[PDB]
Amino acid sequence: LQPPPQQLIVQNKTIDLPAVYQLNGGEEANPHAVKVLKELLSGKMLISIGEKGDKSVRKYSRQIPDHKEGYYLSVNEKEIVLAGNDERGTYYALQTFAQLLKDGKLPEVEIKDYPSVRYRGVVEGFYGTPWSHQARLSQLKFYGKNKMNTYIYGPKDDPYHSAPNWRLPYPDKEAAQLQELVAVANENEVDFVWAIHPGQDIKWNKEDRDLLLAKFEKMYQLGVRSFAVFFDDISGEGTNPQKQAELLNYIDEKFAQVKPDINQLVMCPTEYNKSWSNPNGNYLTTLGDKLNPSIQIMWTGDRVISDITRDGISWINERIKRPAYIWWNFPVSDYVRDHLLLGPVYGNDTTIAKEMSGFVTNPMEHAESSKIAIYSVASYAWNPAKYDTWQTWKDAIRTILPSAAEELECFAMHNSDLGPNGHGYRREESMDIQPAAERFLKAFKEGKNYDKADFETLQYTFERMKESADILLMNTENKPLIVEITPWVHQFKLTAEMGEEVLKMVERNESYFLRKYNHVKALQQQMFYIDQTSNQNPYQPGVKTATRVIKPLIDRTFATVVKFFNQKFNAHLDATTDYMPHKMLPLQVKANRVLISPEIELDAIYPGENIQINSAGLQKAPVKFVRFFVLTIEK
Numbered sequence: 001l002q003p004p005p006q007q008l009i010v011q012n013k014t015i016d017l018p019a020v021y022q023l024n025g026g027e028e029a030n031p032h033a034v035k036v037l038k039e040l041l042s043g044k045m046l047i048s049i050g051e052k053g054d055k056s057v058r059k060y061s062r063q064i065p066d067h068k069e070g071y072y073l074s075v076n077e078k079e080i081v082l083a084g085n086d087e088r089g090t091y092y093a094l095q096t097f098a099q100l101l102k103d104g105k106l107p108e109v110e111i112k113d114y115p116s117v118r119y120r121g122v123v124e125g126f127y128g129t130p131w132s133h134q135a136r137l138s139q140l141k142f143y144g145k146n147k148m149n150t151y152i153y154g155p156k157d158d159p160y161h162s163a164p165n166w167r168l169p170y171p172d173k174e175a176a177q178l179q180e181l182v183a184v185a186n187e188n189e190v191d192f193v194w195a196i197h198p199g200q201d202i203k204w205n206k207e208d209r210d211l212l213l214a215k216f217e218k219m220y221q222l223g224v225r226s227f228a229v230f231f232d233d234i235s236g237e238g239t240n241p242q243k244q245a246e247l248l249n250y251i252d253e254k255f256a257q258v259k260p261d262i263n264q265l266v267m268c269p270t271e272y273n274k275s276w277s278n279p280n281g282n283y284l285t286t287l288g289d290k291l292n293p294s295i296q297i298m299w300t301g302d303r304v305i306s307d308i309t310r311d312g313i314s315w316i317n318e319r320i321k322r323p324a325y326i327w328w329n330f331p332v333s334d335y336v337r338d339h340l341l342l343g344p345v346y347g348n349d350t351t352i353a354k355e356m357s358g359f360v361t362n363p364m365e366h367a368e369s370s371k372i373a374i375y376s377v378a379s380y381a382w383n384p385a386k387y388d389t390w391q392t393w394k395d396a397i398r399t400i401l402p403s404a405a406e407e408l409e410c411f412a413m414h415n416s417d418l419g420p421n422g423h424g425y426r427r428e429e430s431m432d433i434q435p436a437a438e439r440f441l442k443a444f445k446e447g448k449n450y451d452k453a454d455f456e457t458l459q460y461t462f463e464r465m466k467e468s469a470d471i472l473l474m475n476t477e478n479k480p481l482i483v484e485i486t487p488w489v490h491q492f493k494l495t496a497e498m499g500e501e502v503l504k505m506v507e508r509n510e511s512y513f514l515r516k517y518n519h520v521k522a523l524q525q526q527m528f529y530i531d532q533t534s535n536q537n538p539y540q541p542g543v544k545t546a547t548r549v550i551k552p553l554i555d556r557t558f559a560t561v562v563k564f565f566n567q568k569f570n571a572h573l574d575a576t577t578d579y580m581p582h583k584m585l586p587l588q589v590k591a592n593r594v595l596i597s598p599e600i601e602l603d604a605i606y607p608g609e610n611i612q613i614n615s616a617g618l619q620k621a622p623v624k625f626v627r628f629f630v631l632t633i634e635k
């Protein structure tokens with residue numbers, strides 16, 4: 001069961017799902033929950049479904065937890081009970097019930113369940129290509145299955161979300177799409193929260209306030225019932241906390257508290273993590289004091305990218321005078337775009353549920369791939385006391401890709417770290433093989449003999465990686481997932497082939513070694529060609545994989561064996577580990593830039609564009625040699 005329930009008593013009997021059944025409370029329970037129950041009983045004992053207060057569930061009123069979104073669930077030989085404290089609770093009972101049913105069978109169980117954190121879900125809030133409409137449809141259904149009740153729409157690059165077109169209603173096509181997303185959100189018990197991001201060019205006047213409210217009104221007409229205003233990542237007048245708080249309170253008093261049926265009203269502050277706060281400035285205490293108490297305030301932790309600690313959340317809660325609504329910046333990869341972040345969710349304090357109003361994850365622009373972290377976050381926010389990092393990661397993968405779960409585990413296990421970055425945030429990766437790696441390498445470098453078992457583990461790892469990559473490439477169960485990851489799967493296969501060949505180099509005679517060495521060089525060039533043609537975004541272009549432990553191991557082993565060979569045979573083989581066509585500290589190629597890692601000869605004459613050192617326009621001059629750090633060319 002994911003999320004794990006608050007309380008579970010298991011009998012180790014099982015019963016058959018009733019072929020004949022009496023349904024009770026069908027006409028009066030949450031229709032969303034009844035429809036789910038009706039699909040499970042498709043094709044087909046008393047079955048009682050309802051909310052506390054329905055006649056159907058009167059007998060169980062004392063067992064239904066007294067919590068928002070709580071439910072009581074029971075399966076024995078005589079009857080099944082599915083009883084929410086409220087309509088969403090009934091739906092949630094059904095989502096648990098759906099996981100109990102396996103091959104027409106049910107375990108005898110009794111569950112009392114409820115979430116520890118009130119708002120749980122996803123903020124689509126990253127920079128990059130916004131999720132596709134089809135991907136959002138898929139996400140919403142995923143959220144309902146995992147008891148996430150919150151979807152905050154706010155892609156930084158949607159021009160109708162952010163500046164200047166925040167002021168304009170969505171075009172007809174986009175409008176009808178959002179209208180469909182809201183309906184689907186509603187059917188899956190998810191609050192569609194529409195965010196606006198106006199602060200970079202907002203004027204503190206009646207004109208812009210009215211345009212904002214008019215925009216909120218248009219969204220309301222599309223079916224939207226929760227709203228957010230984001231003031232993150234801006235400078236200038238829009239950073240004024242008094243004005244922000246006045247605007248939010250106006251929205252609250254003239255809009256949210258005036259419509260019949262508005263739910264969440266959320267803001268993200270300009271000072272949205274501690275490092276970006278001014279402890280000595282008046283910004284957060286002003287919001288805390290002035291913002292109306294029903295309005296939620298978002299927080300990403302001690303840093304833009306960070307895990308949530310007891311001390312960290314105490315710090316913010318004391319200032320905002322309410323429990324922070326956490327905006328968790330993982331697995332978002334918009335600042336390490338050459339990486340996929342597919343590892344487990346961990347690092348968040350599991351005892352601080354009372355200290356947060358909400359917990360949402362900011363995911364990758366890769367929607368399907370983000371489901372691993374999203375599933376885990378749903379498990380963590382619902383039952384943080386029972387949260388199990390590794391089991392939930394494994395459960396997520398088996399959920400997303402049952403036909404190739406182990407292959408996806410293999411790929412994800414080695415695609416979890418971010419590499420060095422300006423946010424200082426890192427994750428573990430390849431932890432299984434890390435000790436056999438460091439040992440193999442330490443011994444190897446010193447001239448000491450390595451353990452054969454360690455050499456075999458590495459060998460076994462490369463073999464498994466190639467099986468996993470080729471199987472994932474051909475998988476048709478979740479095509480959108482395969483599309484997202486495919487460039488990384490190719491790079492991951494090359495990595496493993498490169499590992500096997502390097503290991504063969506450590507292992508016969510001069511001729512054989514030279515074959516292996518030339519093969520390694522060709523594989524390096526192939527990796528370079530993938531890094532240069534795939535995922536060519538303006539920020540971190542290319543495709544990096546197994547970067548924490550596996551690639552450094554392979555590279556360092558390769559450099560070492562080439563050195564020993566050169567000493568033994570008095571040779572001059574090139575030991576460099578990344579392919580570079582241009583000659584020169586390693587050079588790097590990024591899009592049409594050639595740079596020296598913080599005289600040069602290009603492999604051809606190109607028209608020059610510019611040169612920047614830490615600048616001169618080259619006005620298209622033919623160029624092949626630069627002597628005296630980035631050269632831009634036409635390419």
Ligand SMILES: CC(=O)N[C@H]1/C(=N/O)O[C@H](CO)[C@@H](O)[C@@H]1O
Nearest residue numbers: 125126127232272304332334335
């Ligand atoms: C509140 C917030 O996190 N705003 C942005 C952010 N600000 O530092 O960092 C994230 C990771 O780069 C971005 O995806 C977010 O859109």
